[model samples]
Target: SQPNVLVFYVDDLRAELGCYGSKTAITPNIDKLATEGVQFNKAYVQQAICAPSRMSTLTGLRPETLGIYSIFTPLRSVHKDVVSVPQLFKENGYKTVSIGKVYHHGTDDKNQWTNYFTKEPNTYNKPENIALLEQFKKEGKKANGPAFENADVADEAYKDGRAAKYAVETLKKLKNDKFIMFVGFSKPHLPFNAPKKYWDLYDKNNFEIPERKKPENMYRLALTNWGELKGYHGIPNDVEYLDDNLTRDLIHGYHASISYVDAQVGKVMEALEALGLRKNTTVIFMSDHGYKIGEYGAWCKHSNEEIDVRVPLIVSRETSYKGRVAGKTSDALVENVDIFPTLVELCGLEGPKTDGKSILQVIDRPNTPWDQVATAVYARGKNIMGCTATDGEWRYTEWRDAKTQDILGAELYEHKNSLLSFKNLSGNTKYKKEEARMKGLLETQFPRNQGPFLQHDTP
Candidate 1:
């Protein structure tokens, strides 16, 4: 029997979950996902922004290879001949379907799928919020309505809820086809609007915004101004940092939104079980990228910090698990791009050439050390680009001038014991050997001579 694939891409999701040892986060369904499959503890994306992250993950290429960062340029614009993860299955005589936000900005890689599905984008059930949103647009306001909405509404009232129902219906129709379906969920995103019941799941007191400040000596480029969050109606443009009460509300909204997405994940999983397709289907659960909630004094992603680059990843290959134990956790450094190649190998398909290496070896040996480093990159304001490499204990970045390719700044943070420090330790004499080693790792992964890296940006 040909195995099937399920790829769930949640938008702007962080690694905070009960499965990740988060005491305050409520994510039982995803935690259960970790329990039944292999949960990757240190999986990261090639970039943090929405469009770039999915482009890298789906094409098995880094942003450097894709040569475009922001959503202005679609992926196919650069690599028209590239075969997407879904396209691989589609070309191989399998039914490939995309539901909801599979690719950012709709129809991004339309040819990659045999059938495409979608529902209404994020909407509010409350009349006031709807009227306010329409009113703001009429007045030519950059900020939308409130940053979030806590409407006492049914699950299907929101985009994610409706997407789940659509996915469930689609799953039943494809029961007999050897297929790969991508179901996307958007929540815990900017407008942290979920049903009120999810917000009720958490006590706001549990979410205290960490002292909002940038780490000492970090380059200005290392921290973002978080312009994305400033576009919300409640966020103030005059403030350097969000105030305590607003920050807490933002945090609570994100937590509630995550729990909301968790419920939708459960709904889709229940459908798989009901269809009796759980045994032959290999599943990949992940996010486009991680979100920032007051980390380094930032409100949104687009940084190379662990919170932004690191993401939640879980895989379950039930048909042929290679004698690997279920519910295993891997600390081996991995990236989202590697997922494309791994699935290609798992499904026994002739894989295309990709920049990412297949992580089947990591999946085979979960606890062992697979590699020494993982890489991530980010663009700052169209002028600077940062290339980062980490060995789990240290994160080092070299911010290069985009045009001249000169080193503008550097940041070094020790991740010892899973804790990040505030100070930039790159110039310190004590870190002499460490800095050189990290620089070498970055150099090897992303050389200075690499062409087509972060071009034509709009701030």
Candidate 2:
């Protein structure tokens, strides 16, 4: 029999946690987990958005294979009767449970879990916040409240707090059963809402915004005007950039939301330890995708930049496992899709074939030789899309016509020069060999004849 698996999936979290080298992020629980596990320093998601990233991660397939780029699209519409991570665990005699936003709410595979926990909708505590959310709903807007909110209430006032409570309850109830629990946290996402207690942990004036500079020789279609942030209230419709004060406030709110969720993680971890499950449970903590906090003058995730595509991943196995290694960090270029196969191997369960390979070998040796490559795809519109591949040194991107699959433009950023991608090297004749090599490698992984949006249904 294999050990129980506990996955803490977070929303809109970037590689800015304390363990990932951020000086401002207050994530003690996640940092502590990193010390007790293998922390992936350069893990990336297939896409930078919510639904596509989650779909790829849970299914161990690329988003392009499913052809879903938006949150509204369901996974079953394209690939029916797919074997997901949880569903595989469930089929192998393990009780599976999902709490909070495991998959996009409506796209959650109902048959995958033995029990799925659902919390009441719109769980904000502030009266004005509730009114604002309703107003946004009435207006048919995606945004609910102000750009950010700091409610002076307890942890249980928000949906994430309630989710933690439910996850703890499930852990206690499943003490005697071999269970696979997926605890998803919804915070540090849109609206940037958190309790005042978390807000008090950071000094707003001290928060610093990232340097705002476009990548030199960058393509015109590569940058967005922070359109996602403008959808909320108090934001100017014609906003181009934010001043220092607004930037500080948003950064403050973002950190506050992270701290709030960190507390909730602490609660669930405490329950696991107290119930004597820590020694036999393999805990994996990760976010769906990375987010941009005023990086390159962009407020959200829709690009293939490092800040948008790269995510934080921590995998902690039981102490008794032979491969269990603590306080190790790997710069291996792994993706979210690899999580499925890794867990499958860890739990000793049979799973469907996947595009991602198992990374369990990297857990024991942090500096193991790997493929050293990662891919990220983003859709600009109906006909324009971008695909990027990074080998941890250079990032190569090619924008193409979605309908015809013809190249639109290309970009190459050498991360060794600037990890923020401050300069694009595609136009430089000096790196022509590197550009050609990257394009060839990308074609090997993503063939033009077998494009993502092509009408093939098999995974």
Candidate 3:
């Protein structure tokens, strides 16, 4: 039988796992996976939002290439016949299955999955959450309640529990066949709700709020007020920064959500091993994009900061592959868009031209030479756009007018210069050479003649 593929595509997760140097993240399951696989420490997303990032990884194209940047835009509308990662496997004689929120709701491809399982609406086992939902209904508003919740309930009290349960069932049912299973977890994203036991794992007082100041010399458009968080219930509509207690509370809730999902992931992995399919399966673990937890006065993703653009990626090949390395961590630059080609090559399937290259070289040889340049784009509005390019040592950004192709503002930060500071040094003449070097790299992707066109095939 062909090697089976199991993917844990987490939502809104960053490089916060224990294996990623997060001392506070209780991600033992993910850490264990890292020990058994090759972890890409600097994996990033082409776009920091949900749909665009998801589309990038699934289609092996950048958001700009797809002409999409929002959750409302689905690739099927324009590129209805585009071959997706799951579809590639399905066409190659693998039973493809997706449980939980694989693609954004209503955006999943009907043709790809042999079985697609979606969970029901949010069900709260906690009385407080039930009451909160009721209160919102009574007030004629959506239940966009508090930013965090810790309930004393079992893991099944949430949607993610159902997702994991179904995944285990599917794994058992398909153990004897060539299959590609994608299990997506929703938590660590919004409302920060999780079971109380997971919350109890951390001391709220132990959490520290990061510096609430903006990066020095940062353009006004460099960061957002995190409208996504403010849209929820109980969140103030105009707060410039979160207070210390609230910051700690939110972080505590976020950590608990991660732990909650971590446990569910453990359950799925256990099922794979119990079914005697572990040795024949290639497991991939990753997130849609990185998210900010109170970093830079921001509460969510939608920025180019290292905190927002970086994601966690781990890949474990079937043991049958020769000389496979285990417990390896590579700092080589990688992006979510690379996932499609990597899987195609690993499974020995042919695919169309893609914007991303295969990471199989780095996977087989952890110290292999790699392209250090990684680029990301964020748009606040039609003419307000920010493009960032990082070469590992320095991060360079340019806020440009989308229509006129004029640079509005720029920032350059030396990543390793400060242990606790993100001071922008774009205007300092001392680092002009470094700034020019990074900016020149950025121009290769966002050229002067293209204006707002970020297409890879720009002529």
Candidate 4:
């Protein structure tokens, strides 16, 4: 029997933790994990939303083939026969447990968990809170609710903190056996709802937001289409695009939420150690997708910017692969879909035939030269709005005018120097050659999806 497997998936997190080199935030627990495992720096999601991304990762299938390119649709309507990760483990005589958010609710096998908990209804987002938000909007009040201090109620009151606490309790009760356990945390997504402590942690006054000037390539195309939503990332309508004060407040809250999730992760890690499962378990930590804290003055996670799609992925093989990649960082490109094959290979589990390849080769040789790019797509409505595909060195976002099939805008950035900012290389005649090269990569990477979009489409 193989060591047990645990996947601690957080929502809307980015690789901005300290170990990943964020100058502003501190994430020691996660940083420590980075040092103790393989940190994948160049990771992207198959899609840029919640339900679709989870569905893609759990099933090892793409949205294009699964006919689940959007979040509102039910996954069962598409791939009814698809064998999910946990289900497969259960079939092999391993105990399968899903604590929360295993699959897209209202779709897929949301009910598949032998054990499950929900990340739901904020004390504020509750039905009662819904009317309050509407009232705030109606009154044209930019501010909302009882802004408590972070230390007072933020940590334990928020949904994320509650999830973390549950994880710790769950770990304390595990029985000795091969098991597939999933722990999901939902926070730092919207409502920016954390205890006042996490919010107060940042001085709203002296903060710097990601700078944005329209790209020079107004003629070519950039991803201006954000599906039915507006803004760079997934910032909601309830969130006011306020001045530096409010923006920084949101940023501070997001960082606190991240740290809160990190705390839960620490608890889980400790449980693994106490249970004597650390050395034998395969542990993977990642977010569903990247979040845009201040990038492009955006709040939500829907754009094609690196912040929207580029996520952090870390996997540690507990037994033979212990400390092999401890604390190493690589720019090798990896994606959510890649998890399926990687988990199967690492744990010697049986997985359904799918397109994902085992990432073992990449993890084993973090420095041994590999393609360090990832790709993601988002929609504006029924039309494909933009495509964000990139390598560690370059990022290309192409916005297409759906009705005319014409290029609307383009953004190309060379990360070699401007790591924090991207230089528009699309319309710059000087970089025509570069644009063509990256577009070529997109053509090859996305190729064409079959009708179902989840089935394998051979190149």
Candidate 5:
């Protein structure tokens, strides 16, 4: 019998590990996997928001096809007409089981997996221990220190850690049959929670907070009213002051949370080895979407910046390919849409055709010349939260006009020259050729049914 499939899907994770070039965050387990497996260095999420990206990854569809463009609602996808990864596996005699945070809809639905599990009060991701927060308050320092508290939490406290432990326990009971496991971990997402112990792994003083100088008008902007996004926490413009000890403290906490999640992943891999399942399992680890821990002058991942759309993506196989293409990294512009088809092709199963293209060939052969552009979409067209187009180096953002495709506001930036996006180059006569070049790239990257939000019908 062939090995079972296991997907360790992390929430709100960026491709910013030590292996991915960030100095602060430590993800030894995933870094090790990258060395042994094919790592896609320039991978991107379908969308920056949580729900749409998760839904897209699970169903192998796009935000346009699913009509799930925001995080505020459940998965009531308007055009829900595709087979999910687990459903495809289950149809081929695999016992499918999901244990935590698979989809934004609390639990797995019928078309997705056989069963699902979750943590309670599942609205906000709470990593900070309420009990411990009180203790930190007594010392005059807020519990808001660093990510994952130096990665010293027990394996059962954090939701992702607890879920990983549970999955490992389940792996021990397996008898080498066909079982597709979907393990979801809600860590390194929000509240940047890991036990305080994980925070000690990194020196906060050495950590570099994002250095984007906030526009002077941002400080005077009312925190109580942050335009259309008042539903979420309105972060004060100068949320993290430079040289403020608190700034370093927050970055430290975020890194700790990532480490804590990495340790949990290690536990799952160890369990697979103990059960002798490591030899045949196709273990795929990925994040639903990328997170921004102070990148591009932003805290959370809400922009079309590289730190937000680009993320770490790796697929490891131990049986068929074995050591054929180990420690390889692909620069092909892959998105969440390609995952479903890739898994289907890798498993030697007759999968149905979907909007997403299968990346099986690219994964096996890393030297191929693949496309380099990626697309991302944002809901609420009020501000700079419209559709965004990225071509690895250059990013083009367009705000929709009243009813036509008229350009309301557009900004273009060449990453090679500047880290900060300044000056609108869309209307400039000098960039007329460049604008046309980028627009052509956008159209090519986002074909009729491929990338993230692109509705040609709208103006």
Candidate 6:
């Protein structure tokens, strides 16, 4: 009794959605899906960046295990023998289709699926935006456009809309066979651009700019300096603080892009229901990692802050389903690696051993007290790795020197006071005892790196 698996892999999306208690987001479709299944409250990725996170989730392994921590590393070069989730399904007689940005790179694991359909190339509608790109190239400057854009155009004008169309059509054709489909949407990423209609949903006055300040006693290595967002059209290249007007507009576009992605999801869900495939399908919705829209003065997801490592995870299963099937939210500490084993078990496949444990028990007992904890890491350059562990009560991070295996910086935030992770309580005499316990848990999962890292940087 195998159920068709549909995975929605979104780019740079945070856990802040209508389903996740956001009053600003109009994500009705995602909300409906959450109501129909289990919504995981605290799901963290092994790494905050795209390639490492996707590679870990796809292979059900930790970044440390994979020997991958950067965007440039390919999947096969580091772990050529590892089996991806889709590849496992393909080997097990189930058809697997990748219909969008499933893998961060174009050449990553092409032979794993039956057919690979890529999303549309990003096309900025307005002539001004187009000219801006040309100008950057002509001037031989950094090719950075405005940080956000809301163009008056059709939904299909964007990549995610066209991707939804492809996924919907593919779902209809694969109705007779059990399939694992990855429907990825590329939005809410940099250059927060969505259709104008989505932008119309929000009143500009309601958006609030974050209080931009560095965390107390925060180490200099912790700051990204947001190299990603500085070169945009309106953003100041030299200033410490982004203008309030620009910040508000950027925040508005972020919400708009969220709603735009939600609408495209609606289209796919509608098609699944219309084809009567809803009851025989299991849909898993998640983002690569969390995105910070000026929170802690961090504009992107390169740091090891709580906002950067966490992701939105919702699993809705209508086919071959069992246990608390609908309308529940679980606060279990989960990781992206667990996704692979969860699907393998859901489909009743005796898959190979994975680094993650299946969360079927937590799904069954949605409100029960659980002892699960999540471990996440983000690297500063190639030398230091910020390793963190969160038990839903505390989040502790240690930036360890990769070459020397020395602790360069440490961060500890007591979640009981605030979950924003703005105030650092590390090295505090009050929590000295609890700090050691978190370190013990961290060591159990990932011990200090030895001598040198693997030299396999994509050959």
> All candidates' lDDT scores?
0.83, 0.84, 0.83, 0.67, 0.66, 0.83
Predicted structure with the largest lDDT when compared to the true one:
2
**Against the true structure, what is each candidate's TM-score?**
0.96, 0.94, 0.95, 0.84, 0.82, 0.95
Candidate no. 3 TM-score: 0.95
TM-score, candidate 1, is: 0.96
Off by over 4 Å in 5: 1-3, 76-81, 108-112, 120-153, 214-243, 320-323, 381-385, 416-431, 444-459
Least well predicted 10-residue stretch by lDDT in candidate 4: 450-459
lDDT of 3 by residue, 186-217 (tens): 88888788899999999999987788888887
| Structure candidate 3, residue pairs in collision | 144-233
Models, CA RMSD each: 1.9, 2.5, 2.6, 4.9, 5.7, 1.8
Rank candidates, lDDT, best first: 2, 3, 6, 1, 4, 5
Residue pairs that clash (backbone atoms under 3 angstroms), model 6: none
Evaluation by TM-score, superior candidate among 5 and 6: 6
